Amino acid sequence: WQSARELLRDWPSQRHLADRVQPLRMRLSELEQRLNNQQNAERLLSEFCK
Amino acid sequence: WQSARELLRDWPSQRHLADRVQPLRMRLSELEQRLNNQQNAERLLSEFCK
Amino acid sequence: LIDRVEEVREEMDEAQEAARFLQQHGSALTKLEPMVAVLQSDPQQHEQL
């Protein structure tokens, strides 16, 4: 009874967050492209400093 | 009974989506700077092109 | 130095596992939700009750 209740408590949350995989895919793609640009700017900054 | 069941089905989702606030604040701050830079670039382009 | 790509990837792992679990047990969970209350009453325990 308690385990069934706990499953029926978690399952709605699992269904609610499962649809976010695509929004997360576009979010990570933009964020990783942004991190590549951050790394490039840090490298070019450190290169010119000397 | 059906409305109480529907309400207890909404409660899991209501908490999970209410937790989305802080991640969106950082997204809003970043996106706001992007618009500022877009307008600066558009303005500077228009003034030089004139 | 945000380093949030890892957090977004952990959110993806949890969300893809939630989607995979939904495909694996959705039929079992949907068939369980209309009669969950029966689990509180076991055949021998009904006499002791």
**CB-CB contact of C29 with A8 (8 Å):** yes
Residue type, A48: F
Q: How far apart are CA A46 and CA B29, in angstroms?
A: 27
Q: Which of B16, B33, B37 to mutate to test the interface with A (most CBs of A within 10 A)?
A: B16
Residues 6+ apart with CB under 8 A from A14: C18, C19, C21, C22
List A residues 4-33 in contact with C (Cβ-Cβ < 8 A): 4-5, 7-8, 11, 13-15, 17-18, 20-21, 24-25, 27-28, 31-32
DSSP assignment of chain C equals ---THHHHHHHHHHHHHHHHHHHHHHHHHHHHGGGGGGGG--HHHHHH-
Method: cryo-EM
Distance of CA B33 to the CA centre of its chain: 13
Expressed in Å, this structure's resolution amounts to 9.1
Instruction: Residue A11: list chain C partners with CB under 8 A.
Output: 22, 29
Q: At what angle do helices A2-18 and B2-18 cross, to 10 degrees?
A: 60
